[PDB]
PDB file of all heavy atoms in Angstrom:
ATOM      1  N   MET A   1    -184.334-183.526 -24.208  1.00  0.00           N
ATOM      2  CA  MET A   1    -183.742-182.784 -25.309  1.00  0.00           C
ATOM      3  C   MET A   1    -184.806-181.879 -25.920  1.00  0.00           C
ATOM      4  O   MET A   1    -185.932-181.790 -25.424  1.00  0.00           O
ATOM      5  CB  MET A   1    -183.154-183.729 -26.363  1.00  0.00           C
ATOM      6  CG  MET A   1    -184.197-184.527 -27.136  1.00  0.00           C
ATOM      7  SD  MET A   1    -183.463-185.621 -28.369  1.00  0.00           S
ATOM      8  CE  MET A   1    -182.577-186.769 -27.316  1.00  0.00           C
ATOM      9  N   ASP A   2    -184.442-181.202 -27.007  1.00  0.00           N
ATOM     10  CA  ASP A   2    -185.377-180.315 -27.688  1.00  0.00           C
ATOM     11  C   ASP A   2    -186.575-181.099 -28.198  1.00  0.00           C
ATOM     12  O   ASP A   2    -186.442-181.947 -29.086  1.00  0.00           O
ATOM     13  CB  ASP A   2    -184.674-179.598 -28.840  1.00  0.00           C
ATOM     14  CG  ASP A   2    -185.217-178.202 -29.071  1.00  0.00           C
ATOM     15  OD1 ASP A   2    -186.454-178.030 -29.041  1.00  0.00           O
ATOM     16  OD2 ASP A   2    -184.407-177.272 -29.284  1.00  0.00           O
ATOM     17  N   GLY A   3    -187.745-180.818 -27.632  1.00  0.00           N
ATOM     18  CA  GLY A   3    -188.960-181.521 -28.014  1.00  0.00           C
ATOM     19  C   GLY A   3    -189.740-182.041 -26.825  1.00  0.00           C
ATOM     20  O   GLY A   3    -190.744-182.743 -26.991  1.00  0.00           O
ATOM     21  N   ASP A   4    -189.291-181.707 -25.619  1.00  0.00           N
ATOM     22  CA  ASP A   4    -189.953-182.116 -24.386  1.00  0.00           C
ATOM     23  C   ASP A   4    -190.750-180.948 -23.814  1.00  0.00           C
ATOM     24  O   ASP A   4    -190.421-179.781 -24.042  1.00  0.00           O
ATOM     25  CB  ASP A   4    -188.940-182.612 -23.354  1.00  0.00           C
ATOM     26  CG  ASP A   4    -188.376-183.979 -23.698  1.00  0.00           C
ATOM     27  OD1 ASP A   4    -189.113-184.976 -23.556  1.00  0.00           O
ATOM     28  OD2 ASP A   4    -187.201-184.049 -24.111  1.00  0.00           O
ATOM     29  N   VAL A   5    -191.798-181.279 -23.067  1.00  0.00           N
ATOM     30  CA  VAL A   5    -192.687-180.289 -22.473  1.00  0.00           C
ATOM     31  C   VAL A   5    -192.635-180.425 -20.957  1.00  0.00           C
ATOM     32  O   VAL A   5    -192.569-181.533 -20.419  1.00  0.00           O
ATOM     33  CB  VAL A   5    -194.133-180.435 -23.001  1.00  0.00           C
ATOM     34  CG1 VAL A   5    -194.150-180.349 -24.516  1.00  0.00           C
ATOM     35  CG2 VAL A   5    -194.736-181.755 -22.560  1.00  0.00           C
ATOM     36  N   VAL A   6    -192.638-179.278 -20.272  1.00  0.00           N
ATOM     37  CA  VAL A   6    -192.618-179.224 -18.813  1.00  0.00           C
ATOM     38  C   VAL A   6    -193.473-178.049 -18.363  1.00  0.00           C
ATOM     39  O   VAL A   6    -193.663-177.076 -19.094  1.00  0.00           O
ATOM     40  CB  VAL A   6    -191.185-179.083 -18.250  1.00  0.00           C
ATOM     41  CG1 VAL A   6    -190.414-180.389 -18.388  1.00  0.00           C
ATOM     42  CG2 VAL A   6    -190.453-177.945 -18.941  1.00  0.00           C
ATOM     43  N   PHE A   7    -193.988-178.146 -17.140  1.00  0.00           N
ATOM     44  CA  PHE A   7    -194.740-177.066 -16.518  1.00  0.00           C
ATOM     45  C   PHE A   7    -193.990-176.552 -15.300  1.00  0.00           C
ATOM     46  O   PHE A   7    -193.235-177.285 -14.656  1.00  0.00           O
ATOM     47  CB  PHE A   7    -196.149-177.523 -16.124  1.00  0.00           C
ATOM     48  CG  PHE A   7    -196.177-178.649 -15.129  1.00  0.00           C
ATOM     49  CD1 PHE A   7    -196.338-178.394 -13.778  1.00  0.00           C
ATOM     50  CD2 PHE A   7    -196.057-179.967 -15.549  1.00  0.00           C
ATOM     51  CE1 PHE A   7    -196.365-179.432 -12.865  1.00  0.00           C
ATOM     52  CE2 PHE A   7    -196.084-181.001 -14.640  1.00  0.00           C
ATOM     53  CZ  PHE A   7    -196.240-180.735 -13.296  1.00  0.00           C
ATOM     54  N   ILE A   8    -194.203-175.278 -14.983  1.00  0.00           N
ATOM     55  CA  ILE A   8    -193.510-174.667 -13.851  1.00  0.00           C
ATOM     56  C   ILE A   8    -194.472-174.282 -12.740  1.00  0.00           C
ATOM     57  O   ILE A   8    -195.672-174.133 -12.975  1.00  0.00           O
ATOM     58  CB  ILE A   8    -192.749-173.406 -14.295  1.00  0.00           C
ATOM     59  CG1 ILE A   8    -193.702-172.428 -14.986  1.00  0.00           C
ATOM     60  CG2 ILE A   8    -191.614-173.765 -15.235  1.00  0.00           C
ATOM     61  CD1 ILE A   8    -193.015-171.213 -15.567  1.00  0.00           C
ATOM     62  N   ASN A   9    -193.954-174.134 -11.522  1.00  0.00           N
ATOM     63  CA  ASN A   9    -194.786-173.716 -10.401  1.00  0.00           C
ATOM     64  C   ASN A   9    -194.149-172.509  -9.726  1.00  0.00           C
ATOM     65  O   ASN A   9    -192.945-172.501  -9.477  1.00  0.00           O
ATOM     66  CB  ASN A   9    -194.949-174.854  -9.392  1.00  0.00           C
ATOM     67  CG  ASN A   9    -195.533-176.109 -10.016  1.00  0.00           C
ATOM     68  OD1 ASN A   9    -194.845-176.842 -10.728  1.00  0.00           O
ATOM     69  ND2 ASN A   9    -196.804-176.370  -9.742  1.00  0.00           N
ATOM     70  N   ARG A  10    -194.917-171.454  -9.492  1.00  0.00           N
ATOM     71  CA  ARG A  10    -194.327-170.223  -8.965  1.00  0.00           C
ATOM     72  C   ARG A  10    -194.580-170.031  -7.478  1.00  0.00           C
ATOM     73  O   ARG A  10    -195.161-170.904  -6.833  1.00  0.00           O
ATOM     74  CB  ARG A  10    -194.899-169.044  -9.766  1.00  0.00           C
ATOM     75  N   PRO A  11    -194.140-168.886  -6.915  1.00  0.00           N
ATOM     76  CA  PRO A  11    -194.497-168.622  -5.516  1.00  0.00           C
ATOM     77  C   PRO A  11    -196.002-168.521  -5.494  1.00  0.00           C
ATOM     78  O   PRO A  11    -196.594-168.141  -6.506  1.00  0.00           O
ATOM     79  CB  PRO A  11    -193.862-167.249  -5.237  1.00  0.00           C
ATOM     80  CG  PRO A  11    -193.088-166.875  -6.464  1.00  0.00           C
ATOM     81  CD  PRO A  11    -192.951-168.109  -7.299  1.00  0.00           C
ATOM     82  N   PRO A  12    -196.632-168.828  -4.352  1.00  0.00           N
ATOM     83  CA  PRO A  12    -198.096-168.880  -4.413  1.00  0.00           C
ATOM     84  C   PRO A  12    -198.721-167.628  -4.986  1.00  0.00           C
ATOM     85  O   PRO A  12    -198.454-166.516  -4.528  1.00  0.00           O
ATOM     86  CB  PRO A  12    -198.507-169.038  -2.941  1.00  0.00           C
ATOM     87  CG  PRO A  12    -197.309-168.643  -2.139  1.00  0.00           C
ATOM     88  CD  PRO A  12    -196.119-168.984  -2.982  1.00  0.00           C
ATOM     89  N   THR A  13    -199.564-167.817  -5.992  1.00  0.00           N
ATOM     90  CA  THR A  13    -200.245-166.699  -6.620  1.00  0.00           C
ATOM     91  C   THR A  13    -201.629-167.245  -6.901  1.00  0.00           C
ATOM     92  O   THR A  13    -201.779-168.430  -7.202  1.00  0.00           O
ATOM     93  CB  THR A  13    -199.570-166.296  -7.946  1.00  0.00           C
ATOM     94  OG1 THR A  13    -198.173-166.062  -7.732  1.00  0.00           O
ATOM     95  CG2 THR A  13    -200.204-165.035  -8.521  1.00  0.00           C
ATOM     96  N   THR A  14    -202.641-166.398  -6.805  1.00  0.00           N
ATOM     97  CA  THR A  14    -203.998-166.845  -7.051  1.00  0.00           C
ATOM     98  C   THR A  14    -204.183-167.320  -8.483  1.00  0.00           C
ATOM     99  O   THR A  14    -204.806-168.349  -8.720  1.00  0.00           O
ATOM    100  CB  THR A  14    -205.002-165.722  -6.773  1.00  0.00           C
ATOM    101  N   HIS A  15    -203.612-166.599  -9.443  1.00  0.00           N
ATOM    102  CA  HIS A  15    -203.826-166.949 -10.844  1.00  0.00           C
ATOM    103  C   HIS A  15    -203.292-168.321 -11.221  1.00  0.00           C
ATOM    104  O   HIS A  15    -202.188-168.694 -10.827  1.00  0.00           O
ATOM    105  CB  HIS A  15    -203.198-165.887 -11.752  1.00  0.00           C
ATOM    106  N   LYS A  16    -204.071-169.069 -11.998  1.00  0.00           N
ATOM    107  CA  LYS A  16    -203.620-170.376 -12.467  1.00  0.00           C
ATOM    108  C   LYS A  16    -202.793-170.177 -13.722  1.00  0.00           C
ATOM    109  O   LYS A  16    -202.150-171.106 -14.202  1.00  0.00           O
ATOM    110  CB  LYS A  16    -204.815-171.283 -12.759  1.00  0.00           C
ATOM    111  N   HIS A  17    -202.781-168.954 -14.242  1.00  0.00           N
ATOM    112  CA  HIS A  17    -202.015-168.641 -15.447  1.00  0.00           C
ATOM    113  C   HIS A  17    -200.523-168.810 -15.217  1.00  0.00           C
ATOM    114  O   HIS A  17    -199.764-168.980 -16.166  1.00  0.00           O
ATOM    115  CB  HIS A  17    -202.345-167.238 -15.951  1.00  0.00           C
ATOM    116  CG  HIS A  17    -203.749-167.094 -16.449  1.00  0.00           C
ATOM    117  ND1 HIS A  17    -204.154-167.581 -17.673  1.00  0.00           N
ATOM    118  CD2 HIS A  17    -204.842-166.532 -15.885  1.00  0.00           C
ATOM    119  CE1 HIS A  17    -205.437-167.319 -17.844  1.00  0.00           C
ATOM    120  NE2 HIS A  17    -205.879-166.683 -16.774  1.00  0.00           N
ATOM    121  N   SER A  18    -200.098-168.747 -13.960  1.00  0.00           N
ATOM    122  CA  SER A  18    -198.688-168.928 -13.639  1.00  0.00           C
ATOM    123  C   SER A  18    -198.204-170.304 -14.088  1.00  0.00           C
ATOM    124  O   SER A  18    -197.087-170.438 -14.585  1.00  0.00           O
ATOM    125  CB  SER A  18    -198.457-168.748 -12.138  1.00  0.00           C
ATOM    126  OG  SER A  18    -199.262-169.642 -11.391  1.00  0.00           O
ATOM    127  N   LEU A  19    -199.023-171.333 -13.920  1.00  0.00           N
ATOM    128  CA  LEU A  19    -198.631-172.645 -14.415  1.00  0.00           C
ATOM    129  C   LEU A  19    -198.749-172.626 -15.934  1.00  0.00           C
ATOM    130  O   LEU A  19    -199.813-172.306 -16.463  1.00  0.00           O
ATOM    131  CB  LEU A  19    -199.536-173.717 -13.801  1.00  0.00           C
ATOM    132  CG  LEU A  19    -199.033-175.158 -13.704  1.00  0.00           C
ATOM    133  CD1 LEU A  19    -199.669-175.874 -12.523  1.00  0.00           C
ATOM    134  CD2 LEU A  19    -199.288-175.921 -14.991  1.00  0.00           C
ATOM    135  N   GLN A  20    -197.678-172.996 -16.639  1.00  0.00           N
ATOM    136  CA  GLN A  20    -197.672-172.972 -18.108  1.00  0.00           C
ATOM    137  C   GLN A  20    -196.769-174.073 -18.649  1.00  0.00           C
ATOM    138  O   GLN A  20    -195.811-174.458 -17.985  1.00  0.00           O
ATOM    139  CB  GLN A  20    -197.151-171.632 -18.635  1.00  0.00           C
ATOM    140  CG  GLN A  20    -198.126-170.471 -18.559  1.00  0.00           C
ATOM    141  CD  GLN A  20    -197.709-169.299 -19.423  1.00  0.00           C
ATOM    142  OE1 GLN A  20    -198.396-168.281 -19.481  1.00  0.00           O
ATOM    143  NE2 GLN A  20    -196.580-169.442 -20.105  1.00  0.00           N
ATOM    144  N   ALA A  21    -197.044-174.559 -19.861  1.00  0.00           N
ATOM    145  CA  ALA A  21    -196.195-175.584 -20.453  1.00  0.00           C
ATOM    146  C   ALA A  21    -195.280-174.957 -21.493  1.00  0.00           C
ATOM    147  O   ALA A  21    -195.744-174.258 -22.396  1.00  0.00           O
ATOM    148  CB  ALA A  21    -197.040-176.688 -21.096  1.00  0.00           C
ATOM    149  N   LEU A  22    -193.977-175.205 -21.359  1.00  0.00           N
ATOM    150  CA  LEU A  22    -192.976-174.635 -22.249  1.00  0.00           C
ATOM    151  C   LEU A  22    -192.015-175.725 -22.711  1.00  0.00           C
ATOM    152  O   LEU A  22    -191.704-176.650 -21.958  1.00  0.00           O
ATOM    153  CB  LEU A  22    -192.193-173.513 -21.564  1.00  0.00           C
ATOM    154  CG  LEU A  22    -193.005-172.492 -20.760  1.00  0.00           C
ATOM    155  CD1 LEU A  22    -192.100-171.669 -19.861  1.00  0.00           C
ATOM    156  CD2 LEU A  22    -193.816-171.600 -21.687  1.00  0.00           C
ATOM    157  N   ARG A  23    -191.554-175.603 -23.952  1.00  0.00           N
ATOM    158  CA  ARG A  23    -190.549-176.513 -24.480  1.00  0.00           C
ATOM    159  C   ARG A  23    -189.185-176.195 -23.881  1.00  0.00           C
ATOM    160  O   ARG A  23    -188.852-175.035 -23.629  1.00  0.00           O
ATOM    161  CB  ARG A  23    -190.484-176.422 -26.004  1.00  0.00           C
ATOM    162  CG  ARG A  23    -191.788-176.740 -26.708  1.00  0.00           C
ATOM    163  CD  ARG A  23    -192.117-178.218 -26.617  1.00  0.00           C
ATOM    164  NE  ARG A  23    -193.382-178.541 -27.272  1.00  0.00           N
ATOM    165  CZ  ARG A  23    -193.496-178.881 -28.553  1.00  0.00           C
ATOM    166  NH1 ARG A  23    -192.414-178.943 -29.322  1.00  0.00           N
ATOM    167  NH2 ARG A  23    -194.686-179.156 -29.062  1.00  0.00           N
ATOM    168  N   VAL A  24    -188.393-177.233 -23.669  1.00  0.00           N
ATOM    169  CA  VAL A  24    -187.090-177.099 -23.027  1.00  0.00           C
ATOM    170  C   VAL A  24    -186.048-176.723 -24.071  1.00  0.00           C
ATOM    171  O   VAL A  24    -186.158-177.092 -25.247  1.00  0.00           O
ATOM    172  CB  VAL A  24    -186.700-178.389 -22.282  1.00  0.00           C
ATOM    173  CG1 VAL A  24    -187.806-178.794 -21.321  1.00  0.00           C
ATOM    174  CG2 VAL A  24    -186.410-179.508 -23.263  1.00  0.00           C
ATOM    175  N   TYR A  25    -185.043-175.966 -23.645  1.00  0.00           N
ATOM    176  CA  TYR A  25    -183.943-175.552 -24.499  1.00  0.00           C
ATOM    177  C   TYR A  25    -182.625-175.860 -23.801  1.00  0.00           C
ATOM    178  O   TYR A  25    -182.477-175.635 -22.598  1.00  0.00           O
ATOM    179  CB  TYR A  25    -184.027-174.057 -24.840  1.00  0.00           C
ATOM    180  CG  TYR A  25    -182.865-173.532 -25.657  1.00  0.00           C
ATOM    181  CD1 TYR A  25    -182.766-173.819 -27.013  1.00  0.00           C
ATOM    182  CD2 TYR A  25    -181.879-172.753 -25.075  1.00  0.00           C
ATOM    183  CE1 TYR A  25    -181.707-173.341 -27.767  1.00  0.00           C
ATOM    184  CE2 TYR A  25    -180.819-172.269 -25.818  1.00  0.00           C
ATOM    185  CZ  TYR A  25    -180.739-172.566 -27.164  1.00  0.00           C
ATOM    186  OH  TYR A  25    -179.682-172.089 -27.909  1.00  0.00           O
ATOM    187  N   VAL A  26    -181.667-176.369 -24.568  1.00  0.00           N
ATOM    188  CA  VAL A  26    -180.388-176.825 -24.037  1.00  0.00           C
ATOM    189  C   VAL A  26    -179.369-175.703 -24.160  1.00  0.00           C
ATOM    190  O   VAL A  26    -179.297-175.018 -25.189  1.00  0.00           O
ATOM    191  CB  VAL A  26    -179.905-178.093 -24.764  1.00  0.00           C
ATOM    192  CG1 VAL A  26    -178.778-178.757 -23.981  1.00  0.00           C
ATOM    193  CG2 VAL A  26    -181.060-179.062 -24.967  1.00  0.00           C
ATOM    194  N   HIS A  27    -178.578-175.514 -23.108  1.00  0.00           N
ATOM    195  CA  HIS A  27    -177.512-174.519 -23.099  1.00  0.00           C
ATOM    196  C   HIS A  27    -176.443-174.988 -22.116  1.00  0.00           C
ATOM    197  O   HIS A  27    -176.562-176.054 -21.506  1.00  0.00           O
ATOM    198  CB  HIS A  27    -178.060-173.133 -22.744  1.00  0.00           C
ATOM    199  CG  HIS A  27    -178.729-173.070 -21.406  1.00  0.00           C
ATOM    200  ND1 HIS A  27    -178.032-173.044 -20.221  1.00  0.00           N
ATOM    201  CD2 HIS A  27    -180.040-173.020 -21.071  1.00  0.00           C
ATOM    202  CE1 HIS A  27    -178.880-172.984 -19.211  1.00  0.00           C
ATOM    203  NE2 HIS A  27    -180.109-172.969 -19.700  1.00  0.00           N
ATOM    204  N   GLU A  28    -175.388-174.186 -21.965  1.00  0.00           N
ATOM    205  CA  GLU A  28    -174.250-174.543 -21.131  1.00  0.00           C
ATOM    206  C   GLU A  28    -174.282-173.917 -19.744  1.00  0.00           C
ATOM    207  O   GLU A  28    -173.597-174.410 -18.848  1.00  0.00           O
ATOM    208  CB  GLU A  28    -172.935-174.142 -21.819  1.00  0.00           C
ATOM    209  CG  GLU A  28    -172.472-175.080 -22.931  1.00  0.00           C
ATOM    210  CD  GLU A  28    -172.685-176.551 -22.616  1.00  0.00           C
ATOM    211  OE1 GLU A  28    -172.375-176.979 -21.481  1.00  0.00           O
ATOM    212  OE2 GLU A  28    -173.161-177.286 -23.507  1.00  0.00           O
ATOM    213  N   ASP A  29    -175.050-172.846 -19.549  1.00  0.00           N
ATOM    214  CA  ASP A  29    -175.071-172.161 -18.272  1.00  0.00           C
ATOM    215  C   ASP A  29    -175.872-172.959 -17.242  1.00  0.00           C
ATOM    216  O   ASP A  29    -176.413-174.032 -17.525  1.00  0.00           O
ATOM    217  CB  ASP A  29    -175.655-170.758 -18.429  1.00  0.00           C
ATOM    218  CG  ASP A  29    -174.609-169.732 -18.816  1.00  0.00           C
ATOM    219  OD1 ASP A  29    -173.609-170.117 -19.457  1.00  0.00           O
ATOM    220  OD2 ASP A  29    -174.785-168.547 -18.480  1.00  0.00           O
ATOM    221  N   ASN A  30    -175.939-172.417 -16.025  1.00  0.00           N
ATOM    222  CA  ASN A  30    -176.626-173.073 -14.920  1.00  0.00           C
ATOM    223  C   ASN A  30    -177.967-172.437 -14.572  1.00  0.00           C
ATOM    224  O   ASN A  30    -178.698-172.991 -13.744  1.00  0.00           O
ATOM    225  CB  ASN A  30    -175.730-173.083 -13.675  1.00  0.00           C
ATOM    226  CG  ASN A  30    -175.129-171.719 -13.374  1.00  0.00           C
ATOM    227  OD1 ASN A  30    -175.773-170.686 -13.559  1.00  0.00           O
ATOM    228  ND2 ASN A  30    -173.885-171.711 -12.905  1.00  0.00           N
ATOM    229  N   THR A  31    -178.303-171.301 -15.169  1.00  0.00           N
ATOM    230  CA  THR A  31    -179.540-170.597 -14.865  1.00  0.00           C
ATOM    231  C   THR A  31    -180.606-170.891 -15.915  1.00  0.00           C
ATOM    232  O   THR A  31    -180.325-171.412 -16.996  1.00  0.00           O
ATOM    233  CB  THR A  31    -179.298-169.087 -14.774  1.00  0.00           C
ATOM    234  OG1 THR A  31    -180.518-168.432 -14.406  1.00  0.00           O
ATOM    235  CG2 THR A  31    -178.827-168.544 -16.114  1.00  0.00           C
ATOM    236  N   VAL A  32    -181.845-170.541 -15.578  1.00  0.00           N
ATOM    237  CA  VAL A  32    -183.000-170.751 -16.442  1.00  0.00           C
ATOM    238  C   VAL A  32    -183.303-169.455 -17.180  1.00  0.00           C
ATOM    239  O   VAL A  32    -183.191-168.362 -16.611  1.00  0.00           O
ATOM    240  CB  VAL A  32    -184.220-171.229 -15.631  1.00  0.00           C
ATOM    241  CG1 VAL A  32    -185.335-171.676 -16.557  1.00  0.00           C
ATOM    242  CG2 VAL A  32    -183.819-172.352 -14.684  1.00  0.00           C
ATOM    243  N   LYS A  33    -183.686-169.571 -18.451  1.00  0.00           N
ATOM    244  CA  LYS A  33    -183.982-168.423 -19.290  1.00  0.00           C
ATOM    245  C   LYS A  33    -185.494-168.280 -19.438  1.00  0.00           C
ATOM    246  O   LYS A  33    -186.154-169.167 -19.986  1.00  0.00           O
ATOM    247  CB  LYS A  33    -183.322-168.559 -20.662  1.00  0.00           C
ATOM    248  CG  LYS A  33    -181.867-168.128 -20.700  1.00  0.00           C
ATOM    249  CD  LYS A  33    -180.935-169.248 -20.273  1.00  0.00           C
ATOM    250  CE  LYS A  33    -179.482-168.796 -20.274  1.00  0.00           C
ATOM    251  NZ  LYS A  33    -178.544-169.944 -20.161  1.00  0.00           N
ATOM    252  N   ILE A  34    -186.032-167.162 -18.958  1.00  0.00           N
ATOM    253  CA  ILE A  34    -187.456-166.852 -19.050  1.00  0.00           C
ATOM    254  C   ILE A  34    -187.594-165.508 -19.749  1.00  0.00           C
ATOM    255  O   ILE A  34    -187.038-164.503 -19.297  1.00  0.00           O
ATOM    256  CB  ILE A  34    -188.127-166.823 -17.672  1.00  0.00           C
ATOM    257  CG1 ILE A  34    -188.242-168.236 -17.100  1.00  0.00           C
ATOM    258  CG2 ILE A  34    -189.499-166.169 -17.757  1.00  0.00           C
ATOM    259  CD1 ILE A  34    -189.196-169.127 -17.865  1.00  0.00           C
ATOM    260  N   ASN A  35    -188.341-165.490 -20.853  1.00  0.00           N
ATOM    261  CA  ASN A  35    -188.519-164.262 -21.607  1.00  0.00           C
ATOM    262  C   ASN A  35    -189.326-163.245 -20.802  1.00  0.00           C
ATOM    263  O   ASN A  35    -190.163-163.619 -19.976  1.00  0.00           O
ATOM    264  CB  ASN A  35    -189.224-164.552 -22.932  1.00  0.00           C
ATOM    265  CG  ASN A  35    -190.329-165.571 -22.788  1.00  0.00           C
ATOM    266  OD1 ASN A  35    -191.200-165.449 -21.929  1.00  0.00           O
ATOM    267  ND2 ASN A  35    -190.301-166.599 -23.629  1.00  0.00           N
ATOM    268  N   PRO A  36    -189.087-161.947 -21.020  1.00  0.00           N
ATOM    269  CA  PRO A  36    -189.856-160.926 -20.294  1.00  0.00           C
ATOM    270  C   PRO A  36    -191.339-160.915 -20.630  1.00  0.00           C
ATOM    271  O   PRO A  36    -192.111-160.275 -19.905  1.00  0.00           O
ATOM    272  CB  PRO A  36    -189.187-159.608 -20.719  1.00  0.00           C
ATOM    273  CG  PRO A  36    -187.840-160.008 -21.242  1.00  0.00           C
ATOM    274  CD  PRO A  36    -188.034-161.356 -21.860  1.00  0.00           C
TER     275      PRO A  36
END
């Protein structure tokens, strides 16, 4: 629920900046929301 932390893994990229910890948000759709 709101208050949990998770990290993501991207297509291989040299930068370690791609891995990041973000709080989870609940919604009704099936896709993931990533800000620009």
Side-chain angles (χ1 to χ4, degrees), residues 1-9 11-13 17-36:
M1 69 180 66
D2 213 317
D4 287 287
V5 304
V6 287
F7 61 97
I8 55 185
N9 303 76
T13 307
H17 293 284
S18 57
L19 204 151
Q20 283 196 180
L22 315 165
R23 301 289 179 90
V24 307
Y25 176 75
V26 195
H27 59 76
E28 282 320 315
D29 273 28
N30 49 37
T31 183
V32 190
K33 277 85 182 193
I34 289 293
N35 40 51

